[PDB]
Amino acid sequence: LVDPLTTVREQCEQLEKCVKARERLELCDERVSSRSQTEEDCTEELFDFLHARDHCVAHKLFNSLK
Amino acid sequence: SDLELHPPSYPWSHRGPLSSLDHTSIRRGFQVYKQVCSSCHSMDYVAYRHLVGVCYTEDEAKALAEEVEVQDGPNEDGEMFMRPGKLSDYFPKPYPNPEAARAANNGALPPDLSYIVRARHGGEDYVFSLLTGYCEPPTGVSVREGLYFNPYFPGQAIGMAPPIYNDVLEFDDGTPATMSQVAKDVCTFLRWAAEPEHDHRKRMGLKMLLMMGLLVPLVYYMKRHKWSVLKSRKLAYRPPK
Amino acid sequence: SHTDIKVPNFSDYRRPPDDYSTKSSRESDPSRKGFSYLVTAVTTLGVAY
Amino acid sequence: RQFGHLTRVRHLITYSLSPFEQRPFPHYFSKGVPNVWRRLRACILRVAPPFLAFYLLYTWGTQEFEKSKRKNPAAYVN
Amino acid sequence: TLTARLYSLLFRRTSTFALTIVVGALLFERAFDQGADAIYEHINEGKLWKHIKHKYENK
Amino acid sequence: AAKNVVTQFVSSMSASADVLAMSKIEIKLSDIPEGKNMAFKWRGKPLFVRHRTKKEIDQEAAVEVSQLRDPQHDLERVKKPEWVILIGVCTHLGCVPI
Amino acid sequence: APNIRKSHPLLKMINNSLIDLPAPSNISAWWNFGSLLAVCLMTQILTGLLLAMHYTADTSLAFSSVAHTCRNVQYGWLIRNLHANGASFFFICIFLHIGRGLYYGSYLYKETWNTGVILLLTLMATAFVGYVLPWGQMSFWGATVITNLFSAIPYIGHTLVEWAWGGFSVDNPTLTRFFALHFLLPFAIAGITIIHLTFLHESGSNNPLGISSDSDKIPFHPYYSFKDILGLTLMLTPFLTLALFSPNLLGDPENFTPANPLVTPPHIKPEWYFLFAYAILRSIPNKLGGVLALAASVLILFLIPFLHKSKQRTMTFRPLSQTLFWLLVANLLILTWIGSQPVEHPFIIIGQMASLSYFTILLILFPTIGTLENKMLNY
Amino acid sequence: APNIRKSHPLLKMINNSLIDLPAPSNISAWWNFGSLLAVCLMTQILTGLLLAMHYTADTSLAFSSVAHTCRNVQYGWLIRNLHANGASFFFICIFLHIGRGLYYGSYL
Amino acid sequence: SRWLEGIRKWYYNAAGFNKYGLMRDDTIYENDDVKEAIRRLPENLYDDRMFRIKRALDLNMRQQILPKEQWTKYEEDVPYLEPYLKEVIRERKEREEWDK
Numbered sequence A: 001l002v003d004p005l006t007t008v009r010e011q012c013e014q015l016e017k018c019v020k021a022r023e024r025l026e027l028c029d030e031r032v033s034s035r036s037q038t039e040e041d042c043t044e045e046l047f048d049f050l051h052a053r054d055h056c057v058a059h060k061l062f063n064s065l066k
Numbered sequence B: 001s002d003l004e005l006h007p008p009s010y011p012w013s014h015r016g017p018l019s020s021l022d023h024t025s026i027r028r029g030f031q032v033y034k035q036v037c038s039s040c041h042s043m044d045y046v047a048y049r050h051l052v053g054v055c056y057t058e059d060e061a062k063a064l065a066e067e068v069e070v071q072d073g074p075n076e077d078g079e080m081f082m083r084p085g086k087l088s089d090y091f092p093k094p095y096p097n098p099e100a101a102r103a104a105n106n107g108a109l110p111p112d113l114s115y116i117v118r119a120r121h122g123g124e125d126y127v128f129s130l131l132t133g134y135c136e137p138p139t140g141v142s143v144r145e146g147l148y149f150n151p152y153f154p155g156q157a158i159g160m161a162p163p164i165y166n167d168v169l170e171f172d173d174g175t176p177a178t179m180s181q182v183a184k185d186v187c188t189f190l191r192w193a194a195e196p197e198h199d200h201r202k203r204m205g206l207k208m209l210l211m212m213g214l215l216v217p218l219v220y221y222m223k224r225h226k227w228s229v230l231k232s233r234k235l236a237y238r239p240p241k
Numbered sequence C: 001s002h003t004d005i006k007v008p009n010f011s012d013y014r015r016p017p018d019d020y021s022t023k024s025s026r027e028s029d030p031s032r033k034g035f036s037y038l039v040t041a042v043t044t045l046g047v048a049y
Numbered sequence D: 001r002q003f004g005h006l007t008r009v010r011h012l013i014t015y016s017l018s019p020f021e022q023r024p025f026p027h028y029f030s031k032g033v034p035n036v037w038r039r040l041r042a043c044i045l046r047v048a049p050p051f052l053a054f055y056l057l058y059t060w061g062t063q064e065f066e067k068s069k070r071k072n073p074a075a076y077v078n
Numbered sequence E: 001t002l003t004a005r006l007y008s009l010l011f012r013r014t015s016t017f018a019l020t021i022v023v024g025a026l027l028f029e030r031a032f033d034q035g036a037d038a039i040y041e042h043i044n045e046g047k048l049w050k051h052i053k054h055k056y057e058n059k
Numbered sequence F: 001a002a003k004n005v006v007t008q009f010v011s012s013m014s015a016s017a018d019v020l021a022m023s024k025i026e027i028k029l030s031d032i033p034e035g036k037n038m039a040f041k042w043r044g045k046p047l048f049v050r051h052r053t054k055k056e057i058d059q060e061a062a063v064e065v066s067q068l069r070d071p072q073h074d075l076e077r078v079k080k081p082e083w084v085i086l087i088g089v090c091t092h093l094g095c096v097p098i
Numbered sequence G: 001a002p003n004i005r006k007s008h009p010l011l012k013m014i015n016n017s018l019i020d021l022p023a024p025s026n027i028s029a030w031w032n033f034g035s036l037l038a039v040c041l042m043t044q045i046l047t048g049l050l051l052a053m054h055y056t057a058d059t060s061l062a063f064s065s066v067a068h069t070c071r072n073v074q075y076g077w078l079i080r081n082l083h084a085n086g087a088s089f090f091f092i093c094i095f096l097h098i099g100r101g102l103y104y105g106s107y108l109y110k111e112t113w114n115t116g117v118i119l120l121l122t123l124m125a126t127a128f129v130g131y132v133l134p135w136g137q138m139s140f141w142g143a144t145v146i147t148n149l150f151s152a153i154p155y156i157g158h159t160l161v162e163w164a165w166g167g168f169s170v171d172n173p174t175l176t177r178f179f180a181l182h183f184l185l186p187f188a189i190a191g192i193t194i195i196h197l198t199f200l201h202e203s204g205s206n207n208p209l210g211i212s213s214d215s216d217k218i219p220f221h222p223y224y225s226f227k228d229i230l231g232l233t234l235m236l237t238p239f240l241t242l243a244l245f246s247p248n249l250l251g252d253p254e255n256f257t258p259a260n261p262l263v264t265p266p267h268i269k270p271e272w273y274f275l276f277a278y279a280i281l282r283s284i285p286n287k288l289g290g291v292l293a294l295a296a297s298v299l300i301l302f303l304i305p306f307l308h309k310s311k312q313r314t315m316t317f318r319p320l321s322q323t324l325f326w327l328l329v330a331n332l333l334i335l336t337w338i339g340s341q342p343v344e345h346p347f348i349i350i351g352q353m354a355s356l357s358y359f360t361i362l363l364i365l366f367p368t369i370g371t372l373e374n375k376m377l378n379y
Numbered sequence H: 001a002p003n004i005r006k007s008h009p010l011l012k013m014i015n016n017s018l019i020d021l022p023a024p025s026n027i028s029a030w031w032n033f034g035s036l037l038a039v040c041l042m043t044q045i046l047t048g049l050l051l052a053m054h055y056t057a058d059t060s061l062a063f064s065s066v067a068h069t070c071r072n073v074q075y076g077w078l079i080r081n082l083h084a085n086g087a088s089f090f091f092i093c094i095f096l097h098i099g100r101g102l103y104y105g106s107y108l
Numbered sequence I: 001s002r003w004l005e006g007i008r009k010w011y012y013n014a015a016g017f018n019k020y021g022l023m024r025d026d027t028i029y030e031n032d033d034v035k036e037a038i039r040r041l042p043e044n045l046y047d048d049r050m051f052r053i054k055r056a057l058d059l060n061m062r063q064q065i066l067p068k069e070q071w072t073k074y075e076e077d078v079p080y081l082e083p084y085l086k087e088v089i090r091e092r093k094e095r096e097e098w099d100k
């Protein structure tokens, strides 16, 4: 048993936008967890990703669901 | 920071102004509610009664409601007493009262899911997302003891732990009970739940639209037919000189 | 005067192609009315529903 | 105010035809549609402007807002 | 010739006219519904309870 | 005659002859750690009880009282500066401040 | 009289307001708005009267009751849907009706116009209540501000409110006493509407050119009766479409969560047909100012008749004020957006700004562009 | 018209049903019944509208509600009393009004 | 620099009330003064004006206008009522002042 979601998030996590985003994030992440005192949060960056990811997640996910 | 993430749109089987709800899906949607949400989430405005003819069978729902005992009226000696849930009972409340529930859910109040779908902008799209969508808080961001990060929820810290994973149940119809899948079915239910009229309401809308289509022109002709007397008309000023 | 007066040309300007002189306006329209009425008859109908 | 006591009207000959002897449809594509445009183009330059202006003020307003939300990569370069 | 036949027989006498609106409405109803219902249902095959009523009544 | 009938059928609404006085409530101050604010169900409208931080208490004092709409120093509105209590009812038109 | 249609005390009225009524020949759709407004008054009174057949005005039962009225009562759901939306089709038509009247100086028929205002006001008033009724988060918190909104009026205020609504806080009483007002009010609108038309008939209906029409005037019946029946179905289709396809499209969902006297929803967006004045209110930081602004925000319509300077009635020949007009209509559509928008710099200012052009465009611009255009004609 | 009491669409009605209305000189009390009937219609509508301000239409609350409306609401008791009785003064006047009308063939 | 003359011409065609084919004065809202003014109009011009208005209405009621030809030209617009109307006004202003 495999969740069509996770599979479709695999493909989607590869679309140009995701990548150009997933990257933007990865940096910020290790850009904030690299310092001791910083107010920055990588939420924004996180969204941009998600926003993009799930967007196609939707364009296709419901196709494999009954 | 009033910073939030807005839920992506899923082509639900019932989105179309002319598309009903996949009743099969609701059936499962029901089961997922009954078997996993109806232990934290009250749903006071529905009742087995409904299920009959919409996703369940009379005998089906009846025995379905038997499945629960309900506190009922005074004795002769006057005392609440339990007894088999009839057909007309409303879906069981998990907690005697809110503050009771709040003391059961790490200080939070699992909202009743009767009108949930239309109580939160986004409906299913939101709800679905919310469920299928938890994850580690990005950096610099820290959720406190007892809460669980979920980007889609305002505050990103929810008091509800991810209540849905693969297999959590087993749709007796033979449906890959994957998270995404079940989570879908729960939402299609939450919809009907929120507005059983759905179909009846759209079908209606259909006809309503075919009458406008038919009636308005008719009366338009009539309106023009009648005005032509004027539209046509012609003036002229003829003094004697 | 008044003899100098005429009903202008409403021919194509309006008029259904069943009305352009040389032939009884009658026999013709007693068909036309059916239609315009037909509609109404219908609208009434549609309305009832 | 009722009828017969409206105005002192002299010398106005009007000719109109029964609706059944004329056609309600009318003359679209001849006088019909033409005049419609004769008007879209007449007031378009008097109505649309302000609406257009709003639009801008709407977009501008929204974008800017959506911007003032995103972090200045340099609010902390250190 | 329909329209003429119609007028003379049906639309002329205000007495008659009405009478066909009625008998007509009855017909329009019956027909409009069946049509509508069908159009609708068909646009939702296998989603209606009428359509799943069978996994406890076959199909 | 009228004067009264009026007065009468005018108080036939104001108030209701049903008044309470739950003016007394007990709170476990430990339920409210430093930095957060707990809300309580009290006397028909919300009640705010807050544990203020060193900084919180510090800036609330550094407030330009003379430039205030409702001039009042923080210290004349609270007894234990680490503890501030308020009626969670906005003064404008009656909403619950967040 | 062999007539009868004129010899019968009752029967005449009809054959004197629907048949035989002299109406200008040339009249745009903007004249239907009103006959529509009626149909709303009806659709509202009919549906609501029927919805009251199931309502249960009392905190603990109020919310649910409605839900029941929907889920339980056959087509009860349809009734509700229709009702909440009639509310809008109602405000829409009213908002347009006022438009038309404004830009054809129908406001010159003063009385017919002044009464009109009253109607608006009341329609705004009655719609305020009723929405409280379902007792949702909105219902409640709207009750609490709008009411409390009379806090501003000094001396008689704090008191007038702790009376406006039940006791000392929006609670059950306020609810029951609102239902009553709501159930009652519409019937007032109906009455005044009669008074409205009366004043009208005294002075024939206007007409788009703004010049005598006695020269033409057609029998209301044959013509306009149909024209209304048509417009009926036209701006009936949308309203229905909504009610059958996307009912809550205009209805805030936040109100689907039963009232909580303890937590006003972060994001309290008032009903759309109210936003404009809403904006005006918050963009004038001062309880009183806030309210005052608002007060006049609507209570200004009363002055339009005095802020008329054009030597001509309507303004179809006043291209100048004409665009100033749309500058207004849009300046309104703006305030609205700015109303459905939280308070931050991107907005706020925009707000108080439009919420300034509004007034000026009315109080000053118009009358100025007014006399001006007359002089561009040697008048 | 310098009158006004006759030149105003609304205002006329009044100065045409309360002032200036021609009424027979000779008229017994049996003619008041009606003007009274009105006052009832009012007293009823006024009081009841006001009593509805406290009613709670629902089995479990219906009875009590009224009681509350009396015991709890200032003069609420007076309102009720007045209402239930207006009912009667109402039927009385109506019953008399019909009388009068019957025996003067006003039914003509 | 910019002729009021040049301007009026603008506004005139801009108002475009001549597209319906009626003189300026054929438009001025009918207030107490104008009524008295128009009621002083020689029967010639009256019936003229009438028709022009009825024609105007008839057009307007048809949503259609007058052929580019029949529009009335600015310079040819006949202020047929301005003169009467003026006397009126001053007649009044004379009276209004005397009653003080």
Ligand code: HEM
Binding pocket: B032, B033, B036, B037, B038, B039, B040, B041, B105, B108, B109, B110, B111, B116, B120, B127, B130, B131, B153, B157, B158, B159, B160, B161, B163, B164, B186
């Ligand atoms: C069952 C499939 C299920 C669904 C569906 C679900 C949904 C859900 C929603 C939509 C909300 C939150 C909406 C909001 O913005 O507040 C909500 C909230 C809570 N839930 Fe839930 N939930 C499902 C199941 C369960 C189960 C089994 C539990 C109890 C273990 C649970 C609990 C809660 C709680 C607590 C919240 C509180 C949110 C908060 O205030 O932070 N849910 N749920």
Ligand code: HEM
Binding pocket: G041, G044, G045, G046, G047, G048, G049, G050, G051, G052, G053, G055, G066, G080, G083, G084, G087, G090, G123, G126, G127, G129, G130, G131, G132, G133, G134, G182, G183, G184, G185, G186, G187, G189, G251
């Ligand atoms: C003048 C037109 C009317 C307006 C402006 C109006 C508007 C409203 C509004 C907006 C609500 C809230 C609906 C919602 O929750 O979305 C409402 C509710 C209600 N109205 Fe009206 N109403 C009007 C007339 C009536 C009438 C005449 C009655 C009966 C006397 C009535 C009875 C009710 C009832 C039963 C409710 C409660 C249930 C509900 O919330 O839908 N309404 N009305």
Ligand code: HEM
Binding pocket: G030, G031, G032, G033, G034, G035, G036, G037, G038, G041, G094, G097, G098, G101, G104, G106, G107, G108, G109, G112, G113, G115, G116, G117, G118, G119, G120, G121, G189, G193, G196, G200, G205, G206, G207, G301
């Ligand atoms: C209560 C609801 C109302 C109804 C049902 C109503 C009805 C009418 C109707 C039908 C007319 C006839 C001409 C027309 O349709 O325009 C009319 C005219 C008018 N109404 Fe209303 N009206 C209402 C509210 C208002 C409001 C709120 C205003 C206030 C600005 C208003 C202002 C006018 C004006 C100025 C006219 C006269 C001029 C004209 O008809 O051209 N009305 N109204």
Ligand code: HEM
Binding pocket: H041, H044, H045, H046, H047, H048, H049, H050, H051, H052, H053, H055, H066, H080, H083, H084, H087, H090
């Ligand atoms: C036409 C005149 C009216 C008649 C004939 C009338 C008569 C009555 C009667 C006899 C009762 C029962 C009173 C009792 O228990 O003794 C009653 C109750 C009531 N009426 Fe009316 N009523 C009238 C008008 C109104 C009006 C206009 C309202 C408000 C719309 C109203 C609201 C109520 C209320 C609140 C009750 C319930 C409380 C009570 O029982 O006293 N009534 N009315």
Ligand SMILES: CCCCC[C@H]1C(=O)O[C@@H](C)[C@H](NC(=O)c2cccc(NC=O)c2O)C(=O)O[C@H](C)[C@@H]1OC(=O)CC(C)C
Binding pocket: G014, G017, G018, G023, G027, G028, G029, G031, G032, G033, G034, G035, G036, G038, G041, G042, G189, G190, G191, G193, G194, G197, G205, G224, G227, G228
């Ligand atoms: C027994 C029935 C008696 C008929 C009452 C009914 C009567 O005035 O019906 C029409 C004339 C009225 N509008 C118009 O006359 C009207 C006037 C100028 C132009 C147009 N058309 C635009 O092109 C109109 O449509 C329309 O606005 O309804 C009112 C207002 C009233 O009804 C209302 O009180 C009912 C409320 C009080 C419930």
Ligand SMILES: CCCCC[C@H]1C(=O)O[C@@H](C)[C@H](NC(=O)c2cccc(NC=O)c2O)C(=O)O[C@H](C)[C@@H]1OC(=O)CC(C)C
Binding pocket: H014, H017, H018, H023, H027, H028, H029, H031, H032, H033, H034, H035, H036, H038, H041, H042
């Ligand atoms: C704004 C106020 C307008 C006044 C309305 C009011 C008006 O008709 O007031 C009087 C003339 C009316 N009775 C009489 O005229 C009358 C006639 C012959 C003899 C006597 N006297 C006997 O010796 C009368 O008293 C009386 O029966 O009230 C009615 C009926 C109406 O009022 C009712 O609709 C009100 C109901 C609808 C709430």
